[PDB]
Amino acid sequence: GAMWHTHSEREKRVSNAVEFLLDSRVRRTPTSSKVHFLKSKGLSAEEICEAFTKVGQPKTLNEIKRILS
Ligand SMILES: O=C(O)c1cccc2cc[nH]c12
User: Fold this and answer.
1) How far apart, in whole angstroms, are the C-alpha atoms of residue 63 and residue 69?
2) Could you tell me the residue range of the domain that residue 32 belongs to?
3) What is the Å distance from ligand 1's center to 61 Cα?
4) What's the gap in Å between 2 CA and the centre of ligand 1?
5) CATH code: domain of residue 3
6) What is the number of structural domains in the chain?
């Protein structure tokens, strides 16, 4: 309907991403693989960046954009 729920939808993407990044096997995959996965789930580059900072493994915004280019 008329309510897009943009904020809660963005929050769910980032929290799902944080949970992905913390998975035991996912942690032992390269940053590029993780970035590509999150992009395929509809995260923006900023949201990917935010998720990496939240798991204590900050990546610069430019690093994310380079992987996705
Ligand atoms: O998206 C996840 O939370 C997730 C968790 C554990 C393994 C995989 C593999 C792709 N995605 C995963």
Assistant:
1) 10
2) 1-69
3) 22
4) 32
5) 1.10.10.10
6) 1
**61 in Cβ contact with 24 (< 8 Å):** no
Judge if the beta carbon of residue 22 lies within 6 A of ligand 1. Answer: no
Distance (Å, rounded) from C-alpha 32 to C-alpha 7? 27
Instruction: Provide the experimental method for this PDB entry.
Output: X-ray
62 CA → ligand 1 middle, Å: 24
Q: Best mutation site among 26, 27, 33, 55 for ligand 1, i.e. most ligand atoms within 8 A of its Cβ?
A: 26
